Design a protein around this nucleic acid. Structure first.
Ligand code: MG
Ligand code: MG
Ligand code: MG
Ligand code: MG
Ligand code: MG
Ligand code: MG
Ligand code: MG
Ligand code: MG
Ligand code: MG
Ligand code: MG
Ligand code: MG
Ligand code: MG
Ligand code: MG
Ligand code: MG
Ligand code: MG
Ligand code: MG
Ligand code: MG
Ligand code: MG
Ligand code: MG
Ligand code: MG
Ligand code: MG
Ligand code: MG
Ligand code: MG
Ligand code: MG
Ligand code: MG
Ligand code: MG
Ligand code: MG
Ligand code: MG
Ligand code: MG
Ligand code: MG
Ligand code: MG
Ligand code: MG
Ligand code: MG
Ligand code: MG
Ligand code: MG
Ligand code: MG
Ligand code: MG
Ligand code: MG
Ligand code: MG
Ligand code: MG
Ligand code: MG
Ligand code: MG
Ligand code: MG
Ligand code: MG
Ligand code: MG
Ligand code: MG
Ligand code: MG
Ligand code: MG
Ligand code: MG
Ligand code: MG
Ligand code: MG
Ligand code: MG
Ligand code: MG
Ligand code: MG
Ligand code: MG
Ligand code: MG
Ligand code: MG
Ligand code: MG
Ligand code: MG
Ligand code: MG
Lengths: 134, 270
RNA sequence: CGACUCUUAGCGGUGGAUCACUCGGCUCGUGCGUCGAUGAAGAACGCAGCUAGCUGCGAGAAUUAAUGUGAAUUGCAGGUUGAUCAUCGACACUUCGAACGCACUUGCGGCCCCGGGUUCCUCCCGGGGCUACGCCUGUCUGAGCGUCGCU
RNA sequence: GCCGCGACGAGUAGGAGGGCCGCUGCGGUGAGCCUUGAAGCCUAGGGCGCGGGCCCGGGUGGAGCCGCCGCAGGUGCAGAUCUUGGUGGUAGUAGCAAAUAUUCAAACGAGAACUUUGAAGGCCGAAGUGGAGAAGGGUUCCAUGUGAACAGCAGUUGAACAUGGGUCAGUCGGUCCUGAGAGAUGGGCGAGCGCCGUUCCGAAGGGACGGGCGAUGGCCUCCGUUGCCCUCAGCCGAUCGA
RNA sequence: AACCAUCUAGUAGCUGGUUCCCUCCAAAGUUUCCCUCAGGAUAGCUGGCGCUCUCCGCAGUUUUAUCCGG
RNA sequence: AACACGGACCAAGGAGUCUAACACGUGCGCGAGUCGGGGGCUACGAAAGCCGCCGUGGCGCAAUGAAGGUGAAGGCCGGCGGCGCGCCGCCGGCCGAGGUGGGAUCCCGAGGCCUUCCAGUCCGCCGAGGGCGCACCACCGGCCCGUCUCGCCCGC
RNA sequence: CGCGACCUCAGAUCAGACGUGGCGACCCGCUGAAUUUAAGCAUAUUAGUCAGCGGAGGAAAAGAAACUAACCAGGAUUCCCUCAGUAACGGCGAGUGAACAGGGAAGAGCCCAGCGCCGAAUCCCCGCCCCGCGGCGGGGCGCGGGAAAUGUGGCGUACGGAAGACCCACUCCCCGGCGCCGGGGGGCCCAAGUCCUUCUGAUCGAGGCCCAGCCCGUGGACGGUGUGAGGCCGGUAGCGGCCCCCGGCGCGCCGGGCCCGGGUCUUCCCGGAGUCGGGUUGCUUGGGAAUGCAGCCCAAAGCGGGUGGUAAACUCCAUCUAAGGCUAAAUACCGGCACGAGACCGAUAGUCAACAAGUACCGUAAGGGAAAGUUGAAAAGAACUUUGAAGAGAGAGUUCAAGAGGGCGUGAAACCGUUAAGAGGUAAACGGGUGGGGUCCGCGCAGUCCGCCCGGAGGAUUCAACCCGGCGGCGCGGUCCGGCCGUGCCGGCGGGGCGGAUCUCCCGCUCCCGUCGGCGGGGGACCGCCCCCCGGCCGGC
């Protein structure tokens, strides 16, 4: 149960939050998990996804083991267009199909300055929370 | 709101014109002209007896009756048939007014409290609740009353030593202070037989809180236990005592059905 | 058997009831409880690469700076020493409006200062800064066979 | 609860009882049902109940629903010259009748009684079916293209639609003036937002020329540019109003 | 005796309408008073809830006595 | 049926409600008492629980009278003081809170309810006749407050 | 005459300042209706209400007695409960209608004038200099300028007070700064399966994970995600973490001001006028020989005045000190910002409006004021061929499905077309009773098994009785051994916990002459009730 009284547990207010969310929050919403190998490395459960990340789709029609590269993110529809997931429209032009980020797993991070910075912050809060809970 | 409906101006056309003699909207080339404002039957319009806030919501009740109730309910918790008929699954449980050692208070984690309920073999009721977690029917759905589940077994404690935090995660289980007991929870639906789990302190305190029949309660100012009207409920055993049977008449239990009238003029042997 | 008329069922049409969805209301409650001559409220007119409305904005005109965040917006073209979003203390805010130079025609003005204009002739032109009513404390200049003083 | 005996049964206005009659929602409860297809809907199928109504089969549909014990209600429609929304007969009917009128060929075009040109015949007959303006409308003006909808038949057309263009003043008007009058100030009245009243109980001029004295600016020549003092000044009522 | 909104859902002894089943019982239009006669009260008629006794009392009836009647 | 009115057809909507007070009936709690509703202490809960030196107060337990006020059995023996054997009043002792009729239930119980004929106890059951009488009704007395008439005494 | 003091009144685009309108849910002061009720109506009622006008704040207003009472007396205001539908008013009809005392929330008190003392001991502004300066202040210096005797400051104000003298005892407060240690706003973070099978277009479904009963749980609220998810993501829990800003109490120090008291005895001092009050008129109030308010007229006092709910005269008593002022807390809030919930409503409902709504549109104007939601998981929106001027269609084609093709979910009736069937001169339509034909169903179309018996035919390592082992039921085991209890009862050299309107020396405190009483408390006995220990009776399991 939630005991904090200023947080709301009401259906229409949360749906309103999502469908009318700003870009900077959407960034935070559209997150995906790390594989257990990478989880062994950084000791981190999940990360916000980036434009140039490699991914495996788990469910849907296009599922498999094909590590596809990301092409572009469409936050306004909360969805991403990936390298080989597409279908040909009649005239011939192919179209990348949108996929929801949660149905996706990272195999290789595009590692910038901030990305390493964030992973260390998350690791710090993990070490403190486990030793503190301990 | 009281305003609802009546904000329009609407003079009636009146007699003539072969029309209904109703409050009609005042002019203008648009749909709403002659279109009907007030009246429960008109579109829009004031529903009958606008719902007022100064309705009598709250019903007060007498103290003696409340305490009577808590007593009856507790008496029922000792009876097993009643506990079963409320559906609680309790066959291998050793004793219904199920008392426990006072070390549980010192528990602070659910893994332990669960393993405890396993040792007491009360988990099947929770198992029933888990299987029974499902969706509500109707418009409630859109007003945050979506999910429903069966009620579980009560746990009563005297003093909080972390146990509250420790149990609250298990679905169904209501905790209770003993001093501050509640009926709305003890007898849901006014139906008798919630399965309870007492602690030794709470079990001993009842003798002081309500008293026996020859010692009043020390805590409440003036309150003895509720009196019986008749003690020997089992009339089956009564009715076959020597004394009454001795003093009764003989049961005339032979059935004498309706006789058919045969004609004496015709039938000789009749 | 014909055509016509009546009745029922299958199928197709008109029309949009019912049922299921719900970023809206109503009601109750909590905590705060702040506008304006430093030009408010309201109205008008404008501003987008393709834009009419809705929404946002004031000649810096769908936004500047600063701070936080940390790589997009997207219907279409095109161009990480911080793109984009939010926060908002610096910066700015056209014209009517109590409305304030006098009028409501958007017409007339008045004073002072700059630059072209002179060749100080002052004209002519542009720009800039002032120019509402009432009332208060003080400043200044005045009035009165009002009341005195000296002559 | 079950069972046995007799006697009776019309009913408006009206009263009372029982409703495993039915609707919407709340606490318990059915280890209830459901994408191997819920609700709703359709049905010359099978059945139950005196009845209110309900249960099975079949078809359609694509996500939620019901039984039992208790509680609360905005809880059951044929009518109200009821409300809103939709559809019939009446009807392919009444009708498309104010002021004389059209006809022949040719062109584009898929197609022409009505478009255009030419030819022929008629009318309005300068108190005009003409040429120009005002108030008032506000892009309807002009060109190119379009042929959905509109122009009560049609249209290759149009004041319809879509794209684009277009209004140049010292001298033409407003702007200036006052007109019947409206309307400030002073003054008065008024609980008060405000009102009477327009020369009436008002210290109602900021102007000018010359003289003197002071003050600056210039080929300081001569003349400007501000100030005081002397001398002079009737207005009339601020202001709008063609 | 204009027009717009508000007081305003303004009053009506007067017309009009008023949503499921079955079962059981079942009327009045008469008295008196009212600026009462298209209306109320009030007695009357009706239902429902019961209660005290029953396995001596009562009757829209006659008879026998006895009065009354114009 | 009407030469009385409303109605072309269909779907959806559409009408004795809420609040206060009172009266009667019923169910529940406690009982000469009863009630905390206001106030105070202690996720669902704005609930729930407690308070009695928080029962102030409300309703009831006494009426009547305009008001000052007043306020709900009595009977009998001896004595003492006084008067026409008796009486009034004043001191000590006993019974002491009405009566009649009708009254559902209870009580007494002459006698008796069968084995072979008598003798012979205990337990039941029935019952002639007679009593104590609940509730309730009818009547009769008594008591209380106001009021009227007639009276004679006690007290500081 | 001229010059100079003052007084009174003007003008200035004088230097510096302030007002002016909006919002108006709640508040304050005025003015002020009628519908309607009374079965009519006219006074009353509706009602000091709607509507009009002005002025405010986060609250306002109120408020420290010209009081209540008439008791053994209480003691500012505001608000709740009760006093109460009471006393009273009223064509005595209809109806209207308070207060004081009592228990509660909160609780805080103060200031001038006057009368009088003090070299006006007072104030504002300019100028100059130093510090500080996003709430314009602190300090020093001017023959710098005004205000002020038509009265500035200190003390002090009805609870009395001062001056004077005489005794006793005193030392910390106020203003602003700096640095150092410990609520509010903003930002970023934190557990655990996509494990193995299976249906399906897509799975959040189903089944499974053994004795470490899948993993976490201080986290199983909720939302999202191609159906229905504790463990896929965001969040939720936690005296969990980190980073900024603002505040909050403390400490150490600087530059200034303030130099005040407690009692005693003696002498003096002390109050607010066109106001109270009266007559009179009109409104209002529960206030009735006038409760309040106002207008006119009259017009006062000082051992005085007002009040003491029936006018008046006489009379004693009581209680207050008006006619100058301030003042936070509890209380109110259908407007606003930003927040939370619900036995509410579900597109003819709910605000008029779930949407480009106060929009389109109407009226010269004041004002009036609508209709209108829904493809799909995914735009995959139908390339290509073919007839036709094209609209329109035919094949092919996406999708699980176009039986969802841009006003497109499901798609009833009224109404129409066609098809199939049956019939037809007393308009159609109906109830009862039968017949015929259709329609589909009966999964009909050689028809019941059940016990028991009799008889003939198979087969299984099988029946009874005893032994062993376990368990349950019962016990007149007449009365086997031991417990446990009793809304049962007696004994107590018991130990006590509550209550008592039954009694009871000591202690603590004030007063009187180490002595004598009183009040409060406390042991100390005494009565009732229960609980724990024994012993014994009765009865049960
Ligand atoms: Mg439903
Ligand atoms: Mg159809
Ligand atoms: Mg509809
Ligand atoms: Mg519907
Ligand atoms: Mg723009
Ligand atoms: Mg920037
Ligand atoms: Mg930023
Ligand atoms: Mg003009
Ligand atoms: Mg009958
Ligand atoms: Mg009948
Ligand atoms: Mg379907
Ligand atoms: Mg569906
Ligand atoms: Mg209907
Ligand atoms: Mg004809
Ligand atoms: Mg014709
Ligand atoms: Mg014509
Ligand atoms: Mg003609
Ligand atoms: Mg002619
Ligand atoms: Mg022309
Ligand atoms: Mg044109
Ligand atoms: Mg034509
Ligand atoms: Mg020219
Ligand atoms: Mg005027
Ligand atoms: Mg002019
Ligand atoms: Mg002109
Ligand atoms: Mg009505
Ligand atoms: Mg009306
Ligand atoms: Mg009629
Ligand atoms: Mg006669
Ligand atoms: Mg006739
Ligand atoms: Mg008709
Ligand atoms: Mg009752
Ligand atoms: Mg000035
Ligand atoms: Mg305002
Ligand atoms: Mg009347
Ligand atoms: Mg009437
Ligand atoms: Mg009348
Ligand atoms: Mg009045
Ligand atoms: Mg009144
Ligand atoms: Mg303010
Ligand atoms: Mg105030
Ligand atoms: Mg005041
Ligand atoms: Mg005062
Ligand atoms: Mg009082
Ligand atoms: Mg003072
Ligand atoms: Mg002072
Ligand atoms: Mg003074
Ligand atoms: Mg979900
Ligand atoms: Mg979930
Ligand atoms: Mg699971
Ligand atoms: Mg998570
Ligand atoms: Mg938490
Ligand atoms: Mg009055
Ligand atoms: Mg006065
Ligand atoms: Mg009096
Ligand atoms: Mg609507
Ligand atoms: Mg439609
Ligand atoms: Mg459809
Ligand atoms: Mg039908
Ligand atoms: Mg046919």
């Amino acid at each position: 149960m939630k005991f904090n009284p200023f947080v709301t547990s009401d259906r229409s207010k949360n749906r309103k939050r999502h469908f009318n969310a700003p870009s900077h929050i959407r960034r935070k919403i559209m997150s995906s998990p790390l594989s257990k190998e990478l989880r062994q490395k950084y000791n981190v459960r999940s990360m916000p996804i980036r434009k140039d990340d490699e991914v495996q789709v788990v469910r849907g029609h296009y599922k498999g083991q094909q590590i596809g590269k990301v092409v572009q993110v469409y936050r306004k529809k909360y969805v991403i267009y990936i390298e080989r997931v597409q279908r040909e429209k009649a005239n011939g032009t192919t179209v990348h199909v949108g996929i929801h980020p949660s149905k996706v797993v990272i195999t290789r991070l595009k590692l910038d300055k901030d990305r390493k910075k964030i992973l260390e912050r998350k690791a710090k809060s993990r070490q403190v929370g486990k030793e503190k809970g301990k | 709101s009281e305003l609802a409906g009546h904000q329009t101006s609407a003079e009636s056309w009146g007699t003539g014109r072969a029309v209904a003699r109703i409050p009609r909207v005042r002019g203008g080339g648009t749909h709403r002209s002659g279109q009907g404002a007030f009246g429960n039957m008109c579109r829009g319009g004031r529903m009958f007896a606008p719902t007022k806030t100064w309705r009598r919501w709250h019903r007060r009740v007498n103290t003696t009756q409340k305490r009577y109730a808590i007593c009856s309910a507790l008496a029922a918790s000792a009876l097993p048939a009643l506990v079963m008929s409320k559906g609680h699954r309790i066959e291998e449980v050793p004793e219904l007014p199920l008392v426990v050692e006072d070390k549980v208070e010192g528990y602070k984690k659910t893994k332990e409290a669960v393993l405890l309920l396993k040792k007491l073999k009360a988990w099947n009721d929770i198992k029933k609740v888990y299987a029974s977690q499902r969706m509500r029917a109707g418009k409630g759905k859109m007003r945050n009353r979506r999910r429903i589940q069966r009620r579980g077994p009560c746990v009563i404690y005297n003093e909080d030593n972390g146990i509250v935090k420790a149990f609250r995660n298990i679905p169904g289980i209501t905790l209770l202070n003993v001093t501050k007991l509640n009926i709305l929870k003890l007898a849901p639906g006014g139906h008798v037989g919630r399965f309870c789990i007492w602690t030794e302190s709470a079990f001993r305190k009842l003798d002081d809180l309500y008293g026996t029949w020859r010692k009043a309660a020390s805590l409440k100012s003036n309150y003895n236990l509720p009196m019986h009207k008749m003690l020997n409920t089992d009339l089956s055993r009564i009715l076959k005592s020597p004394e009454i049977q001795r003093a009764l008449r003989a049961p005339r239990k032979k059935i004498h059905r309706r006789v058919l009238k045969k004609n004496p003029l015709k039938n000789l042997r009749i």
